[PDB]
């Protein structure tokens, strides 16, 4: 039993050591490359303009190779855990092995972040030397894409570890613990990936300082591209984490603990999307302060606006998906953990609305920094219209999620009353009051849709921004009023019940 | 029981209210757009020529959006009925709920027609201002296409309501009532859609007044296009209505009542195709009186002729399809409701032949208005040849339907005699006389095909129109004589039977 | 019983009457077209050059339409027989009905041949007037293609009648009679189709008289195209006839009678391919005597050579397929009908070899008429090489068929000895002598392949024609010697048996 | 029994005779072609330049035809064996028949090699006459491709014979004998095919002597192409031979004998890949000594380097595949034949490493002959980098195979201990020590991957060749040390066991 845990501990220690040695090998090769570049700095314009691009290309190739080595190390660690699980029938050693393997994959993603940071700081030391700016930006984007690929591979290995633990586990007290531990590890991986992407965006922001109008615009374009792919990694980590929590719930893992795990996952990923908003806003600030035009200025500002639009949409989508998972788990849960899950869903949706509002403040700050820098006016108006439309979309989706939570909680109240052997006429009265809840909820949803339609009509027509802000304030008042009324009606249904 | 009916009544009242409020929102936004256009009328030629097109584009976007809101309201009303059906085991409340929901979907399609009328009257107020004519026609066609999409969505929701009523219903007296009520609602929807399309064609007819020869021809082209898509909606409404009547017949719904429902459906849809013929004829009159050419005149006249050809063909197809459904239901029916169904089929085919003849009179009026306005002669001859061919095609198809009705009635007489335990030699004599009926029917069909072939030969060769009219009179005499003879032979078979 | 036969007789009489009336309608319309053309002959060069082509196009449209009417009549007659078969349990009336329906489809294909002859004689009366030659040839090819389509439709209706007779029949004495009657009808249909194609080729041969070098070459090209599609109809009629004979054999139809039916089918289709060879040779004679060149002369001669190559190949393929069917039926047959089937297969292969040799004489006559008219020499050498290769291919295939017949007869002798309860050691000696037969047969086949390879090597190298004729004489001597030896070895095996 | 063996002996003697006669026919036709060419040599420049190419084309057509005849002979011999197997229940005659048929297919491939040699010597006698060089090279490549197609057809016939013997055989002592005999025959076929390809490469090497720089480069290109397709035939022969050995093992064929058969197969195919390396090196020597340039010289040298890269890769792949087969058969084998199989795998991997090192020496000799002849420097550096990468790849793959062998042997030791009914705690200790073996093996594999990654990083960066040679020496030291340590750990596990 414990001897298998010690053998896996030794193998994971050796894999951590080889990962550290591979990072040192990357640093050595990057140092050699930088020394060659510095030696060539003294010894034509075309010579430098060509060799610096070749050197950044082979340096990104070296980073991609070290990412491949680290991913192979991760797969071998997963295979080691697979060996250990087979070699063990006990639960204590199994849980200890999963904890140790999650720690190791955390350290491995940390080494990968250090390798990415080395590649980007070397690209900076190269731009010091006078290399290209479009080529440097492209090499940086390739670095970030290989890093995001490593993040996805680690997420899949974490999902496979969760699946092995589910398959070779017969208890709930421990299986839900493994669920929450795997979820903590996935949030850690996505935080490290978002940190890598934020560092790469800051590097592009320090690159655009010495670039031509068009070259700076291309740099901003592919910096928003790397932010888009980091967002894709965040969404994929969320989906895999939620798959893991669904598997355990399916296997009987504690209900309230899985609810707390999904809440913590939603919180961590909303913080990740917030830090990506922050990175995009810093990039937009630098672009506006260096782009130096009247047309490409507004073009880069509008492109950052599309990135923030996608950030808002992904915030809303992750909030809706976690609210729906909590709704299913509520459907399965209990008399009182169901109300705890409804309260937790309300918490997650309040957090998502707050972060969507912070994203709107970020986009408004970017559009004001584009106004003060004197950009195109049509582009700025279109960006403001797009943010009004996107904020309305987030209000719509979060309201739909809250209504779905209220419906699921009412259905759980009814399921509890039916299980507790109440009267038939009484249960008919409860099911008709729940039908009332659903009718008024559908009506509220379509009323929200109608008011959103009116706002979008005025927006595409080209209304003033102050006007749309007041109209959106009205829509928010209406949606909050309708949620409060629907909650009051559901509570009166519950009171009629008991 | 009744409480669920009242809850659904309240939800449908609120959905009717939100639909009315959405129509008011559309009117408000259209008023704002029209005021902006009028304010710009006073304040370049390019400025106006561009902004008026942008304004018509965003106004049609507003109409498309209000159609989307109304369709979402329809889906939510269907979901409300789904809730109510589940919440009810009683038949009276179920039937009352279906009646109320059909009334609501009638009012919803009415609101959609009002929204379409607003969009078209606004496009007219815009052409008053001097916008484009091709762009105005394209915006009008987009409006009509979104309206036809709403009509199809309502038809599918009606079919889903009929299917829910079929699934949650255990009786024939009431289930056939719901069948005929859903069919009345589908005829109402298709009448409203045809009215929207006729109004849009009249709007295009009032547009072509101030358009260039080619611009007027493009306007006429896409007005016939909107008539084609309204015809497609009529055919789809027929197919869905017939699917609904087949489902109930399958479930045991009264036979003679389903026959009366299919007869009324055929009658209403033939009136719809008649009003579309009328709209196409008015459009052709206006085009000929404004196109002002010798080549594009005949081109627009020939295009209206192709539209009338398609109208004739769809009249014939709907008549054949309803005659075939009545033939199947006859196959299932009875001793005497079978003869009632044969009489009703004769009525439907007489009505279809009368409306095909009225369509031929419409096309002849259009070709005479093209002759008097001095158009191309080859195009007019080709149009007359196409109408002779299409009228012959309708005669062929309606005759095939009548023969199929006679065959089905004879088969029902034989099935009745076999069920009533008659002799074996006697039943053999009856089945051989029915084989006689079928032999002479096949011969009659191929004789009609041969005479039609001779007419088409003379037509493609380029015969005179008076000549083809006399030859078509001869073909009609022959087909009526053969139908009378086949009916007499079948009646003599029935007399030999009893 | 007999009353159903009389009712079908009446329906078929009426369908024959309507077919005759449709032929009269075609003659009337063609007469009207020819009168219009003659009236225009007196009343520009472009006027005539355009209107004559339009008139031939609409005349071929009239022919295609009359073919459609005749095919619909055929389908209705099949449906009448279907009614009659259902209406009858007796065998005598069923057989009489099938005989009458085959007679009717014979008369229908005869009317179709008369219609084709009318269309082609009208195209001739038009070329008298001075129409195009390429357009006239294209209209003639379209006429022949519609006629071949009618021939295929009739073949499929004959196959369907054979299948109905098989399905509704319980005896062998009569079922094999119906098999041989359907086969006679299919041979009649393919003879009529080949006659239509030969008449069309003769019409093209009388057209090329007044055509330009290139126009005459195009006429010859598409005349060989119509011969190719008539060959396709012959092959398809063979395949459908053989499918019919296989079905009956499967159903227990007399074995020796099915063998005689396949022999007669092979004989008739070999005569059909012979008459197509004759038509191609007449076309080549006319082309060579009118093409009047040194390059296009040899081009048309080489194209006729490719047509004759395809004729040889299809002769060989039909012979092989019928020999294989007889081999299967032998496998099923008997002690002595098996030897009768082996003798009949020898007869069919002798007939196929004789007709392949006649095809070679036809191609040699064509190449001599191209030599005497002074054509290109490379093309003539390539044509002679292609005929040597094709004659060698036919020798190979027919020898393979004869060897397959000998193998099947030996296998039947062994099956008979095993069924008749002979000794085990004795049956082992017989099966090893049959293995000897198969070994030496495989060796003979590959020796034939090797000698054919040597001839083809010398041919592609460009050997003299007299030389290849002597080498082919040697290959024929070798194949006949090996067949005689293999037959002697099989007969000695049979003698060792008994 | 024996009589069937004698009948098959007679048929195979006749097929050998016809093959010999076909070779004589090819020689006769080639002699005639060469005489025509010599006669034309005396009797324009364009005349010769065209007719010599036409003559080489038709000569390669003659060779392709003789290959087709020989393949048909092979198929007929397979069919003869199929007859004989059916005709025999005894094992002695069956084995004698398979031995005789393998001898015959050996003689047939020998005749095919003689035909290929005749075609190539005739192409040489033609280049004596002054034909093209690109066309001669293309004709030679077509000859070699048809020869490789014949080699593949023979390999498939050998696999089919092995499958027939497996299907109609009930014993292991004899079935494993047939397995090893079929494997010897497949090694013989692949040796003959490699000899044909080496002769063709030598012919191209004697062709490039009188070719233009670009023409010589094209000749070298397609000579390496024929070497590539001969390598493909070697790999396919290996795969089919291994399929055959797997089938017998599946059927119960002796285990240790199948291991010896796979070892001998691997040895023979490694010798084949060695002789292909030798042919490529001779071709590169001739090219460098005749190409006479500074750019195309290095281009041809780099192309030979890619061919040697593919040779190294295929050596490694065949070694890995045979080691994996021996690992499976070990998994099935025994207590001591398992250690014999581990020793044999060590032998095969030592042989594969030695031949990969010889391939590296060949490529280094080619690059030194390109350095001394003064070629491009970038191309030579890229070739040296490619060989360092390929040698590292072969080290990686062979080490993976050796580790897989050690894992399989440990698993067999554990399976033996579990079968021999040892204690449960004892078996748990053994399975945890085997888990130790697997952990340290995974760590060793990823350490090898990391060091290989560092070498490839330095290589793509453009390190010096002496430097990479020392780094590769270090990687080899590390891999040998890790294999020795893993073997010592496994042996200590086995000692703890017993």
Residue numbers in the entry:
A (entry chain B), B (entry chain C), C (entry chain D), D (entry chain A): 1 to 43, 46 to 500
Paper text:
We construct twistless helix repeat (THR) protein blocks from identical straight α-helices (typically 2–4 helices in each unit); the length of the blocks can be varied simply by varying the number of repeat units. Restricting helical geometry to ideal straight helices with zero helical twist in principle considerably limits what types of structure could be built, but this is more than compensated by the great simplification of downstream material design, as illustrated below.
For cyclic designs with this property (those built from turn modules or heterodimers; see Supplementary Discussion), adding or removing repeats simply changes the length of the oligomer edge without affecting the interface between monomers.
